[PDB]
Amino acid sequence: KVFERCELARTLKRLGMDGYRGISLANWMCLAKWESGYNTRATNYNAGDRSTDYGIFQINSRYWCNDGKTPGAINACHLSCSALLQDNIADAVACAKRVVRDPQGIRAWVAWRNRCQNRDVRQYVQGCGV
C-alpha cells in the first residue's frame, strides 16, 4: 500500500508514535517519506552484505526481522520480515519503536540523518489534523 501523507500521519499518531521516546510525528513522517515514499511494499536488497530493507521504514533484515536468508542475522523485533510488508503497519510500528529503544534512537536510520536531522519537518504534518 502507498499511504497518502496525512493518511499516514493520523495512522502513525493512532499507533502511539507522536513523541515515542522524544521523536515527534513529523520526524517519523520525514523518515517514512525518505525511506520508501510511504510505500509498505518497498524492499531494497543490499548485495554488499546480503541483507534486505523491508517496508515503509525500510527495516534491515540483519538485525530486526528474520527472512531466513541473511547470514548470521538476528531478529530483534522478533518478527518475520514478511510482517513489514503488510498494508497494516501496526507490526512495522512496533518494530520501529523497538529500533528506537536503542541508543541511537531515530539516528539508527542514516536516511533520517541525511534528510530529516536538523531540518524543517513541519511540512510533513501540516494540514493533517495531528
UniProtKB/Swiss-Prot annotation:
Residues 1-130 form the C-type lysozyme domain. Its main location: secreted. Disulfide bonds join 6-128, 30-116, 65-81, 77-95. The active site is at 35, 53. SUPFAM superfamilies: Lysozyme-like. InterPro entries: Glyco_hydro_22, Glyco_hydro_22_CS, Glyco_hydro_22_lys, Lysozyme-like_dom_sf. GO terms for cellular component: azurophil granule lumen; extracellular exosome; extracellular region; extracellular space; specific granule lumen; tertiary granule lumen. GO terms for biological process: antimicrobial humoral response; defense response to bacterium; defense response to Gram-negative bacterium; defense response to Gram-positive bacterium; inflammatory response; killing of cells of another organism. Its EC number is 3.2.1.17. It is found in: Secreted. It holds the Pfam family Lys. The keyword Secreted applies. One of its GO terms (molecular function) is lysozyme activity. Keywords: Amyloid, Amyloidosis, Antimicrobial, Bacteriolytic enzyme, Disease variant, Disulfide bond, Glycosidase, Hydrolase, Secreted, Signal. Belongs to the glycosyl hydrolase 22 family. PANTHER family: LYSOZYME C (PTHR11407:SF28). It is linked to Amyloidosis, hereditary systemic 5: A form of hereditary systemic amyloidosis, a disorder characterized by amyloid deposition in multiple tissues resulting in a wide clinical spectrum. AMYLD5 primarily affects the viscera, and the predominant clinical features are renal dysfunction of varying severity, and intra-abdominal bleeding. Inheritance is autosomal dominant. Lysozyme C is capable of both hydrolysis and transglycosylation; it also shows a slight esterase activity. It acts rapidly on both peptide-substituted and unsubstituted peptidoglycan, and slowly on chitin oligosaccharides. This is Lysozyme C. It comes from Homo sapiens (Human). The gene is LYZ.
